[PDB]
């Protein structure tokens, strides 16, 4: 197999050619008819990657690859930009001024993907190591063979890919529209924003809270199965989105079956800058708190920084499998998300009880200080996406006698029968927690069959 560079590939020969390239953009493999699936992607390499810079404005130059197949599974799913692809038996032709490579995988063409970073997106999500630095993490057909001579090509191209992604934007300004201008577009457009929040709307859907360089905040529905690599704080490029005129309560982006959400390789200068530039926004939340009903989800809490890396666990697992699943049994501290349906006791004034550390008993302070140290003994009745349909509500405790969750309410425990200031704040907090679309992201510790909230504060 002879590999030619993008800019040098023949336009006349019309013969099948092969090549190694970097993928900077790609649509999700989509069905076109009763028998055809397509996937379009933009590719670049050392010979083709930037337009005549002078009046070009540092605009990225590229070639396009269009893979055809009879089955979805025969096409590549690109979750991240910057990775490499190797194609065999592709035909190059000019399509409206630009070099277009076509490959019928359903016939004799094949592709293979190589991770530019240590691990492929999938391997990162699954915390797996790569077989080797010459193993395709995805490829067409049943087999793929890498010849000794290829090793150099792949290694060099990886080195190039990083220099390129760290030196340029790769996804130039002309390759996407500013969210604050999205309503002016005729049809679909591309986006490049930061994922400020990933809300689990339901069993199979995620709702991303995106914010780009323009500052505008938009929401969009991202299926869990399709895009499992979405992570709050990361910067992604959305390929093909449309402005939803029907959404009145909040700015929404509609995605199509061919739309794609792509992240960037660790070296991406663009991603790096955006991760630092774009800063979390809570305007929508704050504003929504003035409305009796908010069609926007508001995460009321935040866990201690030392847990921001801890994976979440659904209530379903937390209360229905924690005693049967090998993994869940080995842990005592978990992170989860839910919405409070009811708070106990009903009387907010009883949230703080007197505690006798010797008799291990609490008591009402309606009779005053004669009950010992003051502590919070609140019992939350929660529910989440994983248990949305069942006839259950699950108890999550906030018993601060040992210090766990002591600063949850940002209100030091105190006789709520006397301290009006403390009582009012908690009462208000109670209305928020039980208000529709209010969710809690907290870290809990299992103890004698119960879960206690810890390292979690209201914001």
């Amino acid at each position: 197999y002879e590999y030619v560079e993008l800019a040098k590939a023949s336009l006349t020969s019309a013969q099948p050619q092969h090549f190694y390239a970097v993928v900077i953009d790609a649509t999700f493999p989509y069905k076109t008819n009763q028998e055809r699936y397509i996937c379009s992607l933009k590719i670049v390499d050392p010979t083709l990657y930037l337009k005549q810079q002078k009046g070009a404005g540092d605009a990225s130059d590229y070639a396009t690859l269009v893979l055809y197949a009879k089955r979805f599974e025969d096409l590549p799913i690109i979750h991240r930009a910057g990775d490499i692809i190797r194609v065999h038996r592709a035909t190059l032709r000019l399509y409206n001024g630009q070099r277009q490579f076509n490959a019928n995988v359903f016939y004799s063409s094949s592709w293979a993907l190589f991770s530019t970073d240590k691990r492929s997106v999938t391997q990162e999500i699954n915390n797996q190591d790569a077989v080797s630095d010459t193993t395709p993490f995805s490829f067409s057909s049943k087999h793929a063979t890498i010849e000794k001579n290829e090793i150099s090509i792949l290694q060099n191209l990886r080195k190039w890919a990083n220099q390129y992604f760290s030196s340029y934007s790769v996804i130039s300004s002309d390759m996407y529209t500013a969210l604050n201008k999205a309503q002016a577009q005729k049809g679909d457009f591309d986006v490049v924003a930061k994922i400020l929040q990933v809300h689990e709307l339901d069993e199979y859907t995620n709702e991303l809270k995106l914010k780009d360089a323009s500052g505008q905040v938009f929401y969009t529905l991202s299926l869990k199965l399709k895009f499992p690599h979405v992570r709050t704080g990361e910067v992604v490029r959305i390929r093909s989105a449309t402005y939803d005129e029907t959404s009145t309560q909040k700015k929404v982006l509609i995605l199509s079956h061919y739309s794609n959400i792509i992240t960037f390789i660790q070296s991406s200068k663009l991603a790096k800058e955006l991760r630092a530039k774009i800063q979390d926004d809570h305007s929508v939340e704050v504003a929504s708190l003035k409305k009796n009903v908010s069609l926007n989800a508001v995460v009321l809490t935040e866990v201690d920084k030392k847990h921001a890396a801890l994976p979440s666990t659904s209530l379903q697992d937390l209360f229905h499998h924690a005693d049967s699943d090998k993994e869940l049994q080995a842990q005592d501290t978990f992170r989860t998300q839910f919405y409070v349906t009811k708070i106990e006791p009903s009387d907010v004034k009883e949230w703080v009880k007197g505690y006798d550390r010797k008799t291990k008993k609490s008591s009402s302070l309606k009779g005053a200080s004669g009950k010992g140290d003051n502590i919070f003994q609140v019992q939350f009745l929660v529910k989440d996406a994983s248990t949305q349909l069942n006839n259950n509500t699950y108890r999550v405790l906030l018993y601060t006698q040992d210090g766990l969750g002591a600063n949850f309410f940002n209100v030091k425990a105190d006789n709520l029968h006397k301290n009006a200031d403390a009582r009012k704040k908690l009462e208000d907090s109670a209305e928020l927690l039980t208000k529709f679309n209010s969710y809690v992201d907290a870290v809990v510790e299992r103890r004698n069959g119960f879960y206690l909230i810890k390292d979690t504060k209201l914001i």
Partner: protein
């Protein structure tokens, strides 16, 4: 101002405990909608979303009478005008009914519809399943949240709080997490169902029967 006639209607219905009599009167006017599909699923759009209309046996007979030269299963890409229609809520299995969400569905009951044969409609966006729209889904969730909360506040009483001694000094104490589960209501099965709205009931025709009625 909602530009999607379907989104507004269906939303108000949900926001009004499925009571079609409480929905704005200025919204019960004839519905001129483009037919996206006619078989195996009959789906119409309002220029933004698509919904599945449910035709009463009366509706089809009437149609077939006033329009003998017209097959309903062949109305794709054609436009129709629903003059007499109603809306009602129904409990369904969303895992099977794609035109629903969270085991709930708002149905468009069609009584009388005229096929404006050969009327080209204005170019619109790509119609999406109303029951897959963010806001609407959120509206439906609000509906269930309200119903669930009311149910739990009526079912859970007595401040049965876990005795603090259980979580304090739990060195030699082991327990089963399922000890934290609580019944949200008096529901018979395992799926929450304590809703107040009275599930609408109306005989409707399967899209397959109308196919046989026009081509055995």
């Amino acid at each position: 101002q909602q530009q999607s006639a379907f989104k507004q209607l269906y939303t108000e219905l949900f926001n009004n405990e499925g009571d079609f009599s409480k929905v704005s009167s200025n919204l019960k006017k004839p519905l001129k909608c483009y037919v996206k599909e006619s078989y195996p699923h009959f789906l119409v759009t309002d220029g933004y979303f698509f919904v599945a209309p449910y035709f009463t046996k009366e509706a089809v007979n009437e149609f077939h009478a006033k329009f003998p030269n017209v097959n309903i299963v062949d109305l794709t890409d054609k436009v129709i005008v629903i003059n007499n229609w109603s809306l009602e809520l129904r409990r369904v299995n969303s895992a099977e009914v794609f035109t629903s969400y969270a085991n709930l569905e708002a149905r468009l009951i069609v009584h009388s519809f005229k096929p404006n044969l050969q009327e080209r409609l204005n170019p619109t966006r790509y119609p999406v399943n109303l029951f897959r729209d963010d806001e609407f889904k959120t509206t439906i969730q609000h509906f269930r949240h309200t119903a669930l909360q009311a149910a739990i506040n009526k079912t859970v009483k007595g401040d049965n709080l876990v005795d603090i001694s259980k979580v304090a000094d739990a060195a030699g104490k082991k327990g089963k997490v399922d000890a934290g589960i609580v019944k949200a209501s008096a529901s018979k099965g395992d799926e929450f169902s304590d809703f107040s709205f009275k599930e609408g009931n109306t005989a409707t025709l399967k899209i397959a029967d109308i196919f046989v009625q026009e081509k055995g």
